[PDB]
Amino acid sequence: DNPLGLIDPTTISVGTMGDAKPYAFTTADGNFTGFDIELFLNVAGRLGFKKEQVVFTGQEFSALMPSVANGRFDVAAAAIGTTAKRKETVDFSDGYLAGFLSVLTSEAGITDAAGLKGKRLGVVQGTLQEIYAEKNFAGTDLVKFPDNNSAVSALNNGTVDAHFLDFEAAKDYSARYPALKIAVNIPSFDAPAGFVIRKGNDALRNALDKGLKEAMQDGTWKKLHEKWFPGTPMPAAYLPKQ
Numbered sequence: 001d002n003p004l005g006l007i008d009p010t011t012i013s014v015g016t017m018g019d020a021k022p023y024a025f026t027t028a029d030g031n032f033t034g035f036d037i038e039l040f041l042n043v044a045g046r047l048g049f050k051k052e053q054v055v056f057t058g059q060e061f062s063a064l065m066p067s068v069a070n071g072r073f074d075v076a077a078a079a080i081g082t083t084a085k086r087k088e089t090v091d092f093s094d095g096y097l098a099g100f101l102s103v104l105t106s107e108a109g110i111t112d113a114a115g116l117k118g119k120r121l122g123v124v125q126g127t128l129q130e131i132y133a134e135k136n137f138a139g140t141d142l143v144k145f146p147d148n149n150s151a152v153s154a155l156n157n158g159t160v161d162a163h164f165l166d167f168e169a170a171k172d173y174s175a176r177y178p179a180l181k182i183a184v185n186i187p188s189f190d191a192p193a194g195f196v197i198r199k200g201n202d203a204l205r206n207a208l209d210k211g212l213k214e215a216m217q218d219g220t221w222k223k224l225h226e227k228w229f230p231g232t233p234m235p236a237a238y239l240p241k242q
């Protein structure tokens with residue numbers, strides 16, 4: 001039987017990113033790791049799927065949701081913000097991360113949103129950052145990149161003034177390139193990360209929701225958060241209750 005409506009009932013095919021450190025990324029042997037990866041494998045494990053029964057495929061951010069919508073993957077896990085706009089084509093599990101959208105730059109003069117006037121801002125195609133900048137940073141020239149790596153390369157080259165990306169990923173680039181600093185932090189608590197599933201796949205959605213709640217209640221979520229995001233605040237919503 002196929003109760004979870006999977007492509008193959010013995011395996012879970014997950015669409016992710018090889019370059020979204022520390023959320024999702026690859027090590028030197030090409031295997032996937034990061035917070036979202038370890039959390040997903042933990043949730044899948046509770047559903048009776050061992051680590052060898054979960055396959056990961058790296059894709060550019062913009063291809064993830066359409067690949068799930070087209071039946072290429074059972075799930076997508078890559079700090080995917082939950083929105084009504086995204087809910088038009090896919091379904092989401094309950095939220096498991098809520099953080100900031102960050103402006104990474106070597107220009108100390110940029111201190112807030114109003115500092116982005118007369119600046120060239122990098123965004124990754126299809127991200128919540130692209131939408132936010134189009135709505136709130138009108139007049140700021142946007143430069144669309146397929147990934148963070150290309151955007152940061154143009155930031156290091158001096159072709160863009162700043163790059164707009166996820167807080168933990170901005171922190172990672174700040175460590176890799178010390179001249180780059182997080183100058184602006186924008187709340188994105190209204191779009192928590194959720195595991196993406198095929199629109200209407202209620203059996204897989206409900207089963208992932210059960211595992212996520214259990215991982216949060218037994219303190220697994222807390223342990224994984226402390227590992228991948230040291231010094232980042234943890235909300236009571238995702239921590240053990242009572």
Ligand SMILES: NC(=O)CC[C@H](NC[C@@]1(O)OC[C@@H](O)[C@@H](O)[C@@H]1O)C(=O)O
Pocket residue numbers: 017020023061078079080081082097098099100124126127128129166167188189190191192193
């Ligand atoms: N891997 C990526 O490039 C994802 C970029 C971006 N992520 C936003 C977000 O979901 O990331 C995790 C949390 O910090 C959320 O609050 C946030 O909205 C997006 O969904 O568009």
